[PDB]
Paper text:
We identify and build de novo structures for 19 unique E217 gene products, resolve the tail genome-ejection machine in both extended and contracted states, and decipher the complete architecture of the baseplate formed by 66 polypeptide chains.
We defined the atomic structures of all neck components, namely the head-to-tail, collar, and gateway factors, which connect the icosahedral head to the contractile tail. One unique penton of the E217 capsid is replaced by the dodecameric portal protein gp19, which is an attachment point for the ~1500 Å tail apparatus.
Residue numbers in the entry:
A (entry chain Z), B (entry chain c), C (entry chain G), D (entry chain H), E (entry chain I), F (entry chain W), ...: 1 to 155
H (entry chain g), I (entry chain h): 337 to 384
J (entry chain E), K (entry chain A): 2 to 124
Write the structure that this text describes.
Amino acid sequence: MVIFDEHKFRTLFPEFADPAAYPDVRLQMYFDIACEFISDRDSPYRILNGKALEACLYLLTAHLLSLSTMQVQGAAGGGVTAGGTQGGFITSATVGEVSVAKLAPPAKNGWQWWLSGTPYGQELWALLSVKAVGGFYIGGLPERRGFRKVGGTFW
Amino acid sequence: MVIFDEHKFRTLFPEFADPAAYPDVRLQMYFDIACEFISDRDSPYRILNGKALEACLYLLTAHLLSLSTMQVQGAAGGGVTAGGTQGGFITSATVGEVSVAKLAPPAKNGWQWWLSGTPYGQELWALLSVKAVGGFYIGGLPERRGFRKVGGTFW
Amino acid sequence: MVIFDEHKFRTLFPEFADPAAYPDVRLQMYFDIACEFISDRDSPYRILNGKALEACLYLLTAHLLSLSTMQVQGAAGGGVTAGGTQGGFITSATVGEVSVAKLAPPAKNGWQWWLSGTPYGQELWALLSVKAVGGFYIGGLPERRGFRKVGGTFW
Amino acid sequence: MVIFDEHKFRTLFPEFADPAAYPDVRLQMYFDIACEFISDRDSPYRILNGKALEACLYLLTAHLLSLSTMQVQGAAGGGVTAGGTQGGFITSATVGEVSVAKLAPPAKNGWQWWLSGTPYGQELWALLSVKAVGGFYIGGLPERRGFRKVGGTFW
Amino acid sequence: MVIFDEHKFRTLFPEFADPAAYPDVRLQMYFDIACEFISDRDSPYRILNGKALEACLYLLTAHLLSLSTMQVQGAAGGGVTAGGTQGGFITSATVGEVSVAKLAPPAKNGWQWWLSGTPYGQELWALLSVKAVGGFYIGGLPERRGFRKVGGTFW
Amino acid sequence: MVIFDEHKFRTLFPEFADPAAYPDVRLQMYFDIACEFISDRDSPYRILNGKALEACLYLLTAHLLSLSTMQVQGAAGGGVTAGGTQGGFITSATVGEVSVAKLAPPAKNGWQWWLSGTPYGQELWALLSVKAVGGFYIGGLPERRGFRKVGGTFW
Amino acid sequence: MVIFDEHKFRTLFPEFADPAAYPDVRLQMYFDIACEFISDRDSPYRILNGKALEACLYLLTAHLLSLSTMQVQGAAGGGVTAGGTQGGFITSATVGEVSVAKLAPPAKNGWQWWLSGTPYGQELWALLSVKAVGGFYIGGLPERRGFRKVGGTFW
Amino acid sequence: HGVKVLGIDEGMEQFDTNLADFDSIIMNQYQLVAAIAKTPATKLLGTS
Amino acid sequence: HGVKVLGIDEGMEQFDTNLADFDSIIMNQYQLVAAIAKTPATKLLGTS
Amino acid sequence: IPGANLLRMAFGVIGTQIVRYRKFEQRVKNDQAQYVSMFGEPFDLAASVQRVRRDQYAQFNLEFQRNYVMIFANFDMVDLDRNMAGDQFLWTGRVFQLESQGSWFYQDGWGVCLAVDIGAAKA
Amino acid sequence: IPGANLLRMAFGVIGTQIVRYRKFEQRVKNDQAQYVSMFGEPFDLAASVQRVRRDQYAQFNLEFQRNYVMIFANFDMVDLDRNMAGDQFLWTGRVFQLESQGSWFYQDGWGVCLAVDIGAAKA
């Protein structure tokens, strides 16, 4: 478990600087929820270590907070919408005589598609993609140490 | 069985905070319905354990509650529609001079397609996808502990 | 045979609260019809056991009731439509200057396509999809109990 | 043969309750036509038996009656159209400023395509699809009862 | 040879009730033509036997009658059209601000495509499709009767 | 860790020259965030070394700063947007009587798709692609030094 | 290391003749950056050497200069745009009643897609494509010198 | 007799190597060594 | 008895080489060498 | 098909609003040769309310903006004949002027914003 | 769907501007039978501003080009009734004449350029 710092979180994301609209209890609760999507245990032998793990946890917390605060007060009727607001990437938009079309991200399952909803989720996905290079070797024993090779060595 | 905490549930979702519109008996009934979709037995040897199971159950309850809301006051005329309101992800919409198009999630069966109708369902699907990585090995005996390997070890 | 309870059914689906428009005899008849699509026999060894079975039965009964009540009073002429009202999933719609386009469900046969008609059918399909994971092994005998393995065991 | 209950038939579908518009002889004739599409012989060893088979026959009768209505009074000018009214699932429709698009059912031959014309046909197709799971094995003898297996058993 | 009954034919299809526009001689001639597309002889060993044979013959006769009678009075000039009126399934239609789009039937040869022209042809196609399940085994002899199996039996 | 020079950073990008709008502490924070994505250890045996590594780090810092600006004051109303501004390559755009369409970059995962949001990200991706040509061979021993070849040489 | 000559650069690209808007310090800095995308080391054995290398470096420097100078003065507000101006090839355009559509270049990675942004990049890509014909043979020894062929020769 | 459960998008692949050819080259080199020493290989290696 | 874990976009491939033909070449060369020197191969190489 | 209504299935997707609807029965005088209307039993109806969005004008140094609304409903609504039309209120009283495809399956509407509603739970 | 605010999510892509908006409260007289209005507490609002692009006319030697602006905002704003109008200024005071789909989720605006703003940080 990693101790959540409200001051650092507010410094990193100035859009959450308002203490009245964003109480500390909500941030702590969302951090507690987010520590289940990603393990909060830290060891030096992991892939996401220390500050990287902290950054991922903070980004996930911000993503959850934004998605949650979307519903409560947006529809001009206090979220009177029957089914709430559905998230997701917006490929195209149009307002009067202004039109924008964007590039669809390469989502292939629920995790990435959900992460693509908000910029914090996109940044988290990018960081995970960078850190995901390579692979694991789990089972095996050093069998080659028993045979002499090249220059009379066993390494 | 897992005890359902109504106070903490309303704490999690402020949009359901009204006890007049959402009686506690209705919430208990929906939790009892949702405990059949996902087994609520908790053991340390399950992949879903700890407060993650509570989060999943609460998200499923919220999804069912939102779908229920969509019917009787979603039409708001006592559900006078012949077939009732239908659920599902809305890929495109247009209201007057504003139009937006979103990205279709990768649904492959009834479970994921039904989940993708509301934000709580999407979050539950994402959490399940995160926790679903890996696999199981069911039948097997340690046959490799009978032979001497490498450095005279049996492990 | 499972005893149908009108009071619990009306509690579960408030849109069927009106006793004048929905007599008890009609509900009982539709439950009797629904007990042939899904077997009403119950045993602890079945995949669908416990009150999940009656949940599916109630959902199927509600689906049948909605589809049936569609025809009688739809076209403002007492269902004077020559061929009735055909069911199905509505992919897109438009009323004046409002348009909605939704995601088509993954239907492969008549059963799923029919179930996609109404929200109760969609819920039933989702529950069946969740409970359909795994498989059956029917024939076979424990042949492995006759040989000694690993630590001098026969299990 | 199976006895056709006119009273119960009218009870099932209230839209046919008018005896003046739908004489009993017409219903009996359509039942006699429908008993050739589906064999009405009842045995405990069939997949379709009992009230399920009775409901199948009644649904087929209702489908035939509705299709007959489309021609007799769908045009209502005495069927003055040169080609006659044609049946089938309506994929899309538009009346004035309202347009609706539906999902195409998976029809693979004449039987399912013809069934999908009316809601009763869709219901019959769905019930047949539910009951159709499984398979048959006709030619065969208990060959495995002549050898001793596992625990000295022949079963 | 099945004897054509004019009274039963007029009872089955009320749209042909008028004797002035539909003389008996024309109906008999069209039945005599239709008894060549489908063999009019009956045996108990045939797949199509009993009332199904006469139902198929009546449907084919009605189809031919409709196709023929469309030609002579369509264009309000006694069929003055140079090439006549062509048949076929109407996928889409539009009259003013009323539009309908239908589902194309799965026609693969001339027979089915021609049958899809009129509702009687569609019903005939459906009946043939239902009765067409299975196959024939024509050549072969009971070889297995000469060997002893299982419990000293030769069956 | 490589020392981050704010003076030369502002020299490189004149659009960030204003110290009041972009305090040095914010730049140091974003550099500390960026050094987690790319390892800042410098050795002569890496693919990225010399001023290439610091150029990559500065470009990543500029990308993060530009996205931060887009979030904080892209809306400029305190980020009162429901989910915040989303990033990505803009395939097409239209403002009044002028429309422009561009070529979609070949993105294959979250890293490249996220990078393509801003010109600095595109430049960083291009430099990484240039430097990425070739490959590695890791586990190996000079087994070819023990034999005599061609001109009595062992090399 | 190739010494950058501002006089030759300004002679080659007259659009950068203005010394006030393009100080020599910026040109030298961009040359120092560009000497890292392409190695500035020169040897007679290299595929690109001498004047070809000089032209490649100059083209890359011009490309970088154009991309950089796009941002600072684009939107008539000193690049007040939150995310800057993105680059890329423009496959279509429209201004009033003038429209042009061009051919998309065959870009397959980040390097080529970035190079296609500006004409200098396109020329650099073309030159590299011409000079990229053929391949390298890196390992091997002259084994054929030890055998006699044709006219008693060892060549 | 053990079953591994995997996801739908999962995949597993196996590789094998063939080692039949080593005997011929080993015996050829040993025969050459015996030839250099000017002694029959039966004496050096115990067998032909 | 070990497992390697790779990404969905990653791949692995192997190659071999068949060495079942050098024997005839070597032995033919040695037979020719024996033929040149006017000496039976059973003495120069020690084995036919 | 101009048979089964399309508005009914349309309301199963888009979502609607709720209005109170009252019909016109008969009319009398008030010893000034001025008609006063009578309405009975205002029931509850589900309908879709749309946008037409007025601009204003001038008679002479007065403004007099006309408030307008478009409504879609599956009901037989009459706007004018030798009798009088019906009323509604989303938040204030309203009256319409049009017809639509009532005798088949559904209609369409209009509305001009009358002043206010009485109150006491929006009578 | 006429539920969740579409302009809310659309503003997350295109990008908007910032204006200062003040609402009307009540008005009094100035012993000339001329109404003088008063507003209250101007605040910051996020909106998208468009063009309709004026062309001028003449009365006699007087050109009188009238300046217009189109604004999209998620605010339930009123242009005219038996009360006054609202005000805004991107750089100079403006007043609008229209309505839009306010009671669901968003509206649309207008604007005529009044003369100037006061100054002193653009009051």
